[PDB]
Amino acid sequence: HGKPDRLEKSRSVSIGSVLKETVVCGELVAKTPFFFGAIDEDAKQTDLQVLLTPDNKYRLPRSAVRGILRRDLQTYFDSPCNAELGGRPCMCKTCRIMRGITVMDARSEYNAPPEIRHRTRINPFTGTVAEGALFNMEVAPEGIVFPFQLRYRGSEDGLPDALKTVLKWWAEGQAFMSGAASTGKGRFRMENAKYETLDLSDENQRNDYLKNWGWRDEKGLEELKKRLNSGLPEPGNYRDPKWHEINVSIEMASPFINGDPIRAAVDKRGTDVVTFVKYKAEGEEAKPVCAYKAESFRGVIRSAVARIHMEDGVPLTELTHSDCECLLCQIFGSEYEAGKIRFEDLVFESDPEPVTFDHVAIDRFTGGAADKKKFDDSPLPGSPARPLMLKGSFWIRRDVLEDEEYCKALGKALADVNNGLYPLGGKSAIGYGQVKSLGIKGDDKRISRLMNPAFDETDVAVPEKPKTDAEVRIEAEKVYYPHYFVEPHKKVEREEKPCGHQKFHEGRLTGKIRCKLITKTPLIVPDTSNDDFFRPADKEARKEKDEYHKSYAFFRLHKQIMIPGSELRGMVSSVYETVTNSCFRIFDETKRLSWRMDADHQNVLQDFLP
Amino acid sequence: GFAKLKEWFRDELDFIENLKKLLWFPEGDQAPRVCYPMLRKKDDPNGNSGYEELKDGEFKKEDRQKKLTTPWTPWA
Amino acid sequence: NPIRDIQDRLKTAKFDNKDDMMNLASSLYKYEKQLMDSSEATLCQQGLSNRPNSFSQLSQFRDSDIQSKAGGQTGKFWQNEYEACKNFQTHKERRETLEQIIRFLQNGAEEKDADDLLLKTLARAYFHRGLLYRPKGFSVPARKVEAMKKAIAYCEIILDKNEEESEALRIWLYAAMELRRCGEEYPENFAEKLFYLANDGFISELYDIRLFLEYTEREEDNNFLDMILQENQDRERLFELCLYKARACFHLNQLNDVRIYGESAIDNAPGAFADPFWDELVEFIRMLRNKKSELWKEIAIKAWDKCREKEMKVGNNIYLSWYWARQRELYDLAFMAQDGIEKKTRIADSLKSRTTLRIQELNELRKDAHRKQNRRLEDKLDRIIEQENEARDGAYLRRNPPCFTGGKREEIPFARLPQNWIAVHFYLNELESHEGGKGGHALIYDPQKAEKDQWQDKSFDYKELHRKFLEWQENYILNEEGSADFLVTLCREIEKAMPFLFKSEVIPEDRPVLWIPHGFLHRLPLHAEIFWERHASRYLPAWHLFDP
RNA sequence: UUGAUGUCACGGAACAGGAACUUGAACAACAUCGUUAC
């Protein structure tokens, strides 16, 4: 808490007879969902709350603005203060400015409930989520305005140089106020600035200032807002900000999904898994937009870095990162030191509506459906004709770009993401986010000089196909059957420790194969979104429920003939697990059978006593 | 890859012969008529001894899991 | 590997003894704890062999336990976990294991069915975590204080039902004795619990000798004073035992036996200044001084003589230090007790310009040396870092001090000055200026006068000069025309506070004077009555920087 | 519910670390129901 000193000294300082009070008014708008920690008790469902007003209005506290001003002033001068909460006042350059600044609060009148996000933690050995590692966090929307007033009472001719430079940084759009800045929380922008310098050194202006208690109340502020001059003062010594912004663009060809189970449980559509949407405030009402989260992109890039670098034998994914100095623990921060890269959300450059895709699970024995289960999903549609762009930006700081090894690590990771590995999104086993083209601009070719494609040149044609030998004796006038089960062997070669996705191993292979399919008999792959495709015109549409004659069509994505990846995965999986003599990978182990009994058999009906 | 299949199963690759017999495609001038039987014999104009004349005959209850494992066996 | 053990314990489970059931519960807990974090043993994807028998046994174990939830399972498992955590290597793994224990068993201690073993081991985990907190602000961190307070709260939860425990009472007293030396106040019930412990006796450790000595000095009893004198030698920490024996033999008036134990205790002091031994040494000296004894002079001088050799040489001209926050006090106590003037100015020169740094800048320097691919700065800074961070658990479990010597800095002799120069050394005492003493001293050396009186010592007050200097400094950076007469009143204060500089027998009339200042006298506005027109004045920060 | 001759608390950013991920061909042939007669 405290400890004031009570045996210090007594002094007497004369501070001249000049006094000037400068007012800077305006507003500041949110460009990203912000966060202000107010984690209170008696509510343990969500473990990261936000600060709200007793009538549920988002407020921006005074202490946060004051702390951010102190941090930016200690950034301008390249010397941090070493005060220790006691004794006589500090006489350095930063506190001597902070001793004459007055700010106010804000309310924003929006009063809509905040939105809850979820975060997990992925096991880098099996690829799935870890055990019991799941936590939520409620965030505030985007586009919320706050009024802004700042008074400086000093002895100089207007504001100092440091305050003019810091206000220029805040007008550029680099006012990183609060929150979890590592995942791209509140980044505000100061708009409509106005400034006015009073003169308390004379006698008439001092009396006119004392006559109205300053201009602190609301009527005094509405009277003062008619004597303000537009535009901020120009600084004398513009130093520089220390956060660079570099833009990213990603797009190739495939559908996209980013899971959200609670929205799937509430949504009107009713599908099993849907994508992620976010709201933005339009003054009073909110509007939804589909996006790619910031936590997911941060995790993907962190995993692409952590799987390459050796760190004396044991790779960076097998460490614990608690109290260590690693390469991943320096760029991406730890729980002892803050990070250095701030990611952001990614929007889709259009209004792509989601489609619906159905799937079923085919039994191995008696190949039919599973226990009558159809499961569907609602991804965003992307095709080789409509590539579904993704535009975004992320921030790094100055001393990371000046180094040589950090840019090397980031270039290696982004070159591995650009080539096709590390697919973004959800169900990548059936081709979601399949390929990429990652373009990064705004760093003066410091990182994007390792993301150049290099390839070899063998010119060797794939070795021919062999001629078969298994032949059958087929005659005429003898009608056959279409089923013919295949009796398997009795020994299955199991193993309890599979490889693990922790790194790229030594004697293993990684890459991709390009194929070429050709049909020899008519092919049917249906498009089950609507049933009355071949229905004639000029009649009734359909009643609420009848049993008509269903009529499907062929599968199309953007008026373009395609075959999904699930079909090919299923057929190649069936042949592959028949060859190696594997288990019945999908089966219905329950559901006892039942048979009718015959009347001729009088030996079984001789002991069914009444 | 083939050598690995020689390490587990030594010389009992007799589920690969049937798999190669079931993926066979009619090369040419061969029209193997396949279809499913009818229920009775009085409801198909060909007279092919439907499902109720096979349960007491070739496809008996004891010889049924032998004529359903050989790859191309003639039903009728 | 952790799934075959469950089946090995499930094979011979007898469901009647309290050893096989405990082993089964331990195996289940270890498998679950292996799953909670993501280790390399998560790739094992097998199961149990005999399904129906194992299902019957596991359902009978989860069903024949709910009537016996007496806390016998989790308490013993976490007890053995902490017991394995105590005997570890370097502090990193000890810290991580302690925070994992604290995180896992903090929930099960908030109900009425709270075991004594569970609360005892939770309080011990809090107390042992409270010792491993690296400071970074020239002051003690608040998390250490609140770890001590939480340990006290849980040991009070236990001792509210019983009266004597002889295990939780010792944790309570350890936490109080740790709160005392962190600048805090004793808890309100210290005397009663100290009297409950003193009425049992039987010390068997090293902490309990300190608790008993505190009790006998609190109530003036001579019961345990002879029992703590027959302890065995050749233990793991000899110096602390010799210090305790000296403090004991002091209370029964055994002189010429306190000095020998003190001298044998000084010689084997640990190399780290964070060890909980130097603080007790300064407390012993402070207690010897204000009892109007005369024994404290020898101990203070010997402690300074063996404390100076703890520096670190990293190059050919510079040195490093440690900052243990009581060095000023020990140096002032060694200055107040030394009578020879040349020895007093040899004392005053060891407090001059040094490199007393803290942890964060040493970390910066280590990363700087690893930036320039150096190798003589990753084995000399490494010793400092991994030595002063390992001596935090010094009296709980610790072993011999793992360090080495510090070398010997060569001393420049006072006979290197020319015959015309006059040397002046300044020192600002703080211990005797906190009382009504006459502040600081000046030491004048004339190297061409008689040998029997070659040194003069003068004393003066320095509070009002400090106030005048502060007023001028505060008026200098907020004005430049209203800071004109503050300079002249500061110069008059200089001429008034130390009036012996304007004499004739000391500082003869026209000889060049060499000033060596200390403290806030380095920043005096002595630019141009004053001696900057008659005597040849020149500065020097310390006397070991005198080349010609 | 304060006490007077002495309050820099506008002297202090609730901040810092965690990929809603993994598994699934929109596919398909044999019956259903019980009693009659000596």
Q: Do A27 and A175 meet the contact criterion of CB atoms below 8 Å apart?
A: no
3-state helix, strand, coil in chain A (%, to 5): 20, 20, 65
Cα–Cα distances (Å) from C164 to A11, C126, C191, in that order, read 56, 21, 14
Is strand D less than 7 A from the beta carbon of A128?
Answer: yes
Q: Do A354 and A219 meet the contact criterion of CB atoms below 8 Å apart?
A: no
Structure tokens at C119: 């609360």
Q: Is the CB of C97 inside 8 Å of chain A's CB atoms? A: no
Per the CB < 8 Å rule, is A476 touching B72? no
Look-up: residue for tokens 């001068």? A77
B-chain CB neighbours of A365 within 8 Å are none
A25 is in an annotated binding site: no
CB contact set of A575 (below 8 Å; sequence gap of 6+): none
Per the CB < 8 Å rule, is A14 touching C475? yes
A-chain CB neighbours of C137 within 8 Å are 84
Distance from the Cα of residue A269 to its chain's centroid: 24
**C200-210 as b/e: b if 16+ CB within 10 A:** eeebeebebbb
Per the CB < 8 Å rule, is A479 touching B24? no
A-chain CB neighbours of C479 within 8 Å are 14-16
Cα separation, C343 vs C341, in Å, equals: 5
From first CA to last CA, the distance across chain C in angstroms is 73
Question: Given its phi and psi angles, is residue A218 left (phi above 0), alpha (psi -120 to 50 degrees) or beta?
Answer: alpha
Angle between helices C485-497 and C463-476 (to 10 degrees): 160
Structure tokens at C248: 């004991």
Look-up: residue for tokens 């002094």? A11
A81 is in an annotated binding site: yes
Per the CB < 8 Å rule, is B72 touching A468? no
Nearest CB neighbour to C43, from listed A126, A318, A320: A126
Cα separation, C421 vs C532, in Å, equals: 16
Q: State which H helix or E strand residue C239 sits in.
A: helix C238-251
3-state helix, strand, coil in chain C (%, to 5): 50, 5, 45
Q: Which nucleotide is nearest to A84 (CA to C1')?
A: D11
Three-state DSSP string of A307-351:
CCCCCCCCCCCCCCCCCCCCCHHHHCCCCCCCCCEECCCEECCCC
The upper half-sphere exposure of residue C139, i.e. CA atoms within 13 Å in the direction of its Cβ, equals 13
Q: Do A32 and A21 meet the contact criterion of CB atoms below 8 Å apart?
A: no
Q: Do C147 and C137 meet the contact criterion of CB atoms below 8 Å apart?
A: no
Mutate to test the interface with B, among A484, A490, A492, A584 (most CBs of B within 10 A): A484
Angle between helices C142-158 and C168-180 (to 10 degrees): 150
Cα separation, C461 vs C428, in Å, equals: 9
Q: Is the CB of C471 inside 8 Å of chain A's CB atoms? A: yes
Q: State which H helix or E strand residue C365 sits in.
A: helix C359-371
Q: Which nucleotide is nearest to A64 (CA to C1')?
A: D13
Is strand D less than 7 A from the beta carbon of A235?
Answer: no
Look-up: residue for tokens 């903090």? C106
**Torsion over CA: A83, A89, A91, A92 (sign):** positive
Look-up: residue for tokens 């399919």? A517
Cα separation, A357 vs A528, in Å, equals: 8
DSSP structure string for C302-325? HHHHHHSS--EE-SSS-EE----S
B-chain CB neighbours of A484 within 8 Å are 22, 68-73
Q: Is the CB of C84 inside 8 Å of chain A's CB atoms? A: no
Cα separation, C99 vs C92, in Å, equals: 11
Structure tokens at C503: 């004499």
From first CA to last CA, the distance across chain B in angstroms is 40
Residue nearest to nucleotide D7 (CA to C1'): A4
For residue A119, which of A181, A183, A179, A34 has the smallest C-alpha distance?
A: A183
Question: What is the Cα Rg of chain B in Å?
Answer: 18
Structure tokens at A216: 């602190």
Per the CB < 8 Å rule, is A11 touching C474? yes
**DSSP state, A554?**
B
Q: State which H helix or E strand residue B4 sits in.
A: helix B2-8
Look-up: residue for tokens 């410091």? A446
> How long a stretch of residues is chain A?
610
Residue nearest to nucleotide D11 (CA to C1'): A85
Three-state DSSP string of C436-465:
CCCEEEEEEECCCCCCCCCEEEEEECCHHH
| Window 460-499 of chain A: CB closer than 7 A to strand D | 482-483
Cα separation, C523 vs C251, in Å, equals: 48
Is strand D less than 7 A from the beta carbon of A37?
Answer: yes
Nearest CB neighbour to A480, from listed B8, B34, B68: B34
| Window 343-402 of chain A: CB closer than 7 A to strand D | 358-362, 366-370, 373-375
Cα–Cα distances (Å) from C188 to C185, C192, C235, in that order, read 9, 9, 35
AA letter at A426: G
Structure tokens at A103: 């700010």
Cα separation, B14 vs B7, in Å, equals: 15
Q: Which nucleotide is nearest to A179 (CA to C1')?
A: D15
d(CA A606, C1' D34) / Å? 17
Q: A459: exposed, middle or buried (C-beta count within 10 Å: 0-12, 13-18, 19+)? A: exposed
Cα separation, C510 vs C359, in Å, equals: 49
Structure tokens at C339: 């009578």
Cα separation, A509 vs C341, in Å, equals: 81
Give the technique used to solve this structure.
cryo-EM
Q: What is the dihedral of CA A161, A166, A172, A173, to 10 degrees?
A: -170
Question: Taking CA atoms, what residue in A is nearest to C3?
Answer: A496
Cα separation, C238 vs C234, in Å, equals: 7
Chain D footprint positions (protein CB, under 7 Å): 6, 8-35
Question: What is the Cα Rg of chain C in Å?
Answer: 31
Question: Taking CA atoms, what residue in C is nearest to A16?
Answer: C479
Look-up: residue for tokens 């058999």? A601
Count of Cβ atoms closer than 10 Å to residue A17 Cβ: 7
Cα separation, A1 vs A85, in Å, equals: 9
Residue A224 phi/psi, 5° resolution?
A: -70, -25
Structure tokens at A75: 């950034």
A549 is in an annotated binding site: no
CB contact set of A543 (below 8 Å; sequence gap of 6+): none
A-chain CB neighbours of B30 within 8 Å are 474
Cα separation, C266 vs C248, in Å, equals: 16
Listed in sequence order, the DSSP H helices in C375-457 are 381-388, 431-434
Residue A23 phi/psi, 5° resolution?
A: -110, 135
AA letter at C503: K
A326 is in an annotated binding site: yes
Give all chains having 3 or more CB-to-CB distances under 8 Å with chain A: B, C
Cα separation, A285 vs A112, in Å, equals: 8
Question: Given its phi and psi angles, is residue A372 left (phi above 0), alpha (psi -120 to 50 degrees) or beta?
Answer: left
> Helix count (H) and strand count (E) of chain C?
21, 7
Nearest CB neighbour to A479, from listed B15, B33, B68: B33
Question: Taking CA atoms, what residue in C is nearest to A132?
Answer: C36
**DSSP state, A130?**
E
**DSSP state, A207?**
H
Which SS3 state, helix, strand or coil, does residue C390 take?
A: coil
d(CA A112, C1' D10) / Å? 31
Q: Is the CB of A123 inside 8 Å of chain C's CB atoms? A: yes
A-chain CB neighbours of B9 within 8 Å are 489, 491, 581
For residue A378, which of A361, A360, A358, A349 has the smallest C-alpha distance?
A: A358
A-chain CB neighbours of C96 within 8 Å are 320, 322-323
Cα–Cα distances (Å) from C26 to A51, C5, C80, C101, C446, in that order, read 44, 10, 10, 15, 80
CB contact set of A153 (below 8 Å; sequence gap of 6+): A19, A20, A21, A22, A100, A102
The upper half-sphere exposure of residue C481, i.e. CA atoms within 13 Å in the direction of its Cβ, equals 2
Count of Cβ atoms closer than 10 Å to residue A272 Cβ: 14
Cα–Cα distances (Å) from C353 to A450, C312, C416, C445, C516, in that order, read 50, 15, 21, 21, 12
Cα–Cα distances (Å) from C36 to A46, A131, A136, C58, in that order, read 21, 5, 19, 21
Cα separation, C284 vs C299, in Å, equals: 10
Q: What is the dihedral of CA C515, C521, C522, C524, to 10 degrees?
A: -100
Structure tokens at A241: 């900000």
Listed in sequence order, the DSSP H helices in C51-167 are 51-63, 74-86, 91-105, 116-129, 142-158
| Strands (E) located in A110-156 | 115-122, 129-139, 145-154
Residue nearest to nucleotide D22 (CA to C1'): A128
CB contact set of C244 (below 8 Å; sequence gap of 6+): C209, C210, C213, C228
Structure tokens at C115: 């075991």
Distance from the Cα of residue C220 to its chain's centroid: 28
Q: Which nucleotide is nearest to A276 (CA to C1')?
A: D20
Q: Which nucleotide is nearest to A571 (CA to C1')?
A: D25
Strands A101-103, A145-154: pairing is antiparallel
Question: Taking CA atoms, what residue in A is nearest to B6?
Answer: A580
Cα separation, C521 vs C516, in Å, equals: 9
For residue A341, list its beta bridge partners.
A396
Per the CB < 8 Å rule, is A470 touching B70? no
A-chain CB neighbours of C139 within 8 Å are 84
d(CA A551, C1' D17) / Å? 55
For residue A248, list its beta bridge partners.
A392, A440
**C99-129 as b/e: b if 16+ CB within 10 A:** ebbbeebeebbeeeebbeebbbbbbbbbbbb
| Window 31-50 of chain B: CB closer than 7 A to strand D | 36-39
Q: C30: exposed, middle or buried (C-beta count within 10 Å: 0-12, 13-18, 19+)? A: middle
